[PDB]
Amino acid sequence: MRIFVELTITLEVEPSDTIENVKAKIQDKEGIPPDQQRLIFFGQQLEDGRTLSDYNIVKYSTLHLILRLPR
Amino acid sequence: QQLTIEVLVTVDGVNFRTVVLNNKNTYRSQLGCVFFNGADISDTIPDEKQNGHSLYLADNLTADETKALKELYGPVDPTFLHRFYSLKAAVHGWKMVVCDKVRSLKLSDNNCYLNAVIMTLDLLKDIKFVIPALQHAFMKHKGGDSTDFIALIMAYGNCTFGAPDDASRLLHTVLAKAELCCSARMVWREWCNVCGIKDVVLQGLKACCYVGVQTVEDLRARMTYVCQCGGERHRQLVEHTTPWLLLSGTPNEKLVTTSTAPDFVAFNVFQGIETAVGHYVHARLKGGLILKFDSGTVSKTSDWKCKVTDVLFPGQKYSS
Ligand SMILES: [Cl-]
Ligand SMILES: [Cl-]
Ligand SMILES: [Cl-]
Ligand SMILES: [Cl-]
Ligand SMILES: [Zn+2]
């Protein structure tokens, strides 16, 4: 499964991956620390404990990225 | 030995277990990280004066104490209990003022972001936390003792004492462990020219909060993204019943004025530079002026150019 993270990058992911697992693969790409990562999907802030299945993250879903303030 | 004491140990204040200790080693070596009357006494030698009192344990939990830990706090990280106890002691130095029956957190150790979070949570009607420790600390907060709730949300939000943090991040992290006690719905009409039209429905607390927009007009605006088939997919709000709407966005400059009588009831403000340390201010719209609750201090102005982050709107009644 491929998803997109907002500039826009694309990640190869599985529906069982947690949000912390997604933030981990973002740090390997963009270098942003996972603590400073805010992932938004459908206006809902994603919690590290939950998986992409809980938020119904499907194919070609777009996750918005906001930095923790202060940046 | 020399002296033997029997203390009671708890992780939830309800269930206890007796531990026989010595005066030949510290609490940490015999029992672990323990707090007594809100103080880390782990590296002290047990005294006979502290015989039959209760200790709050932070590590070296038994099998049943981890079960009691999860039933009270939920699946927490291994450092949660030690951070929560440490935060609860440092927050005790803070002060919660109540000016005209609305609570505000005095400025201390860059806690202005906690002021915006707390003062916004006070306005959210019919909310209740699904975690017992959060709900217990929330009731004590609404009763006049907020140190438990302040330290808890800092522990769940992984906040460091004395360091500035994100008020919008913590506000939604806290709301993620809450539910709404009244009916609330929002219906997004999705459609792709290939697959077709499909409705999705969010009910409860998720139908009252959105991160990305800061005005209602931006919420019902048509949105475009990529469908599962790989084609263009659209989305638009077509039904919205709610008791209140919390719209959060990045700090955005806006001229909040009492000339047009805005429809929202409260909003948060981020003052300063984003890359540098900034100051959060909570604001409410009482009467016909803006009430800026700036961490214990109160101000009033008819107009204000500010970088708005969160906005709180009244009940929604919308359909199309
Ligand atoms: Cl945690
Ligand atoms: Cl209040
Ligand atoms: Cl306090
Ligand atoms: Cl169609
Ligand atoms: Zn399609």
Residue numbers in the entry:
A (entry chain B): 1 to 6, 11 to 75
B (entry chain A): 1481 to 1800
Manuscript text:
Here we applied protein engineering technology to target virus-encoded deubiquitinating enzymes of two viruses with significant impact on human health: Middle East respiratory syndrome coronavirus (MERS-CoV) and Crimean-Congo hemorrhagic fever virus (CCHFV). This resulted in the rapid identification of ubiquitin variant (UbV) inhibitors that bound with high affinity and specificity to the viral deubiquitinating enzymes. Strikingly, coronaviral PLpros also act as vDUBs to suppress host antiviral innate immune responses by targeting cellular Ub-conjugated substrates. The CCHFV vDUB domain is located within the large (L) segment of the genome, and has also been explicitly implicated in the evasion of host Ub- and ISG15-dependent innate immune responses.
To reveal the molecular basis for the inhibition of MERS-CoV PLpro by UbVs, crystal structures of the enzyme were determined bound to ME.2 or ME.4. Both UbVs bound in nearly identical orientations as Ub.wt with interface surface areas of ~1000 Å2. Substitutions common to both ME.4 and ME.2 at positions 46, 64 and 70 were found to promote more favorable hydrophobic interactions with the enzyme relative to Ub.wt. In comparison to Ub.wt residue Val70, UbV residue Ile70 extends further into a hydrophobic pocket of PLpro formed by residues Thr1730* and Val1691* (asterisks denote amino acid numbering of MERS-CoV polyprotein). UbV residue Phe46 inserts into a hydrophobic pocket formed by PLpro residues Trp1668*, Glu1670*, Val1680*, Leu1682*, Tyr1690* and Tyr1705*, and forms a cation-π interaction with Arg1715*. The UbVs also differ in their C-terminal residues at positions 74, 75 and 77. In ME.4, Asn74 extends into the active site and forms a hydrogen bonding network with Asp1645* and Gly1758*, which mimics hydrogen bonds formed by the same region of MERS-CoV PLpro with Ub.wt residues Arg74, Gly75 and Gly76. In ME.2, Pro74 cannot form an analogous hydrogen bonding network, which likely contributes to the decreased inhibitory potency of ME.2 compared to ME.4. Instead, Pro74 and the C-terminal tail are excluded from the active site and the main-chains interact through a hydrogen bond formed between the main-chain amide nitrogen of Arg75 and the backbone carbonyl of Glu1754*. A structural comparison of the C-terminal regions of ME.2 and ME.4 near the PLpro active site is shown in S4 Fig. Additional substitutions in the N-terminal region of ME.4 and ME.2 (region 1) do not make favourable contacts with MERS-CoV PLpro, and in fact, residues 8–10 and 7–10 of ME.4 and ME.2, respectively, failed to resolve in electron density maps.
